[PDB]
Structure 1
Amino acid sequence: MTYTRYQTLELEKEFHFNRYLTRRRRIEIAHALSLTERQIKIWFQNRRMKWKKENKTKGEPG
């Protein structure tokens, strides 16, 4: 069970665009994806924890 490739794409695009999803924009992306908000928030948080372990070479000192 997985979010779609598109949804994941749009999420990473949103993560690139912005780091912290406020009420309205989270709804907007959640509509654009079609997920239940909670999921987007979770994805956004977890995305941080699997941002900084992928963003290596540059991101060694943190």
Structure 2
Amino acid sequence: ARTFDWMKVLRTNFTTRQLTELEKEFHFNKYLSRARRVEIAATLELNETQVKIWFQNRRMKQKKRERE
């Protein structure tokens, strides 16, 4: 058919070591403070943004788990 608007609209590879540490933190606190964010990032060799986004996505999959 016709090509509508929607048709016209680097991905970090986390190590097993990083995901394991990210989970651990998650189970300690669902939300992170600016303090603990910088700390985890340094330890894991990541940016605060990546840590921030991973937590965001993690919370959402939790919601999608308690709801299914």
TM-score (ref. length: structure 2)? 0.74
Choose between structure 1 and 2 for higher RCO, CA contacts under 8 A separated by at least 6 residues: 1
CA shift for structure 1 position 21: 0.8
TM-score (ref. length: structure 1)? 0.80
**Which residue matches 2:39?**
28
1:10-53 deviations in Å (ceiling 9; x for gaps): 00000001111111100011011110110000000000111233
**Which residue matches 1:2?**
13
Q: Kindly report structure 1 stretches of 4+ aligned residues shifted beyond 3 Å.
A: none
Alignment identity in percent?
A: 61
Aligned length in residues: 57
Which residue of the other structure, out of 53, 57, 63, is the alignment partner of 1:52? Answer: 63
RMSD: 1.6
Q: Max radius of gyration: which structure?
A: 2
Structure 2 unaligned residues grouped into runs of 5+: 1-11
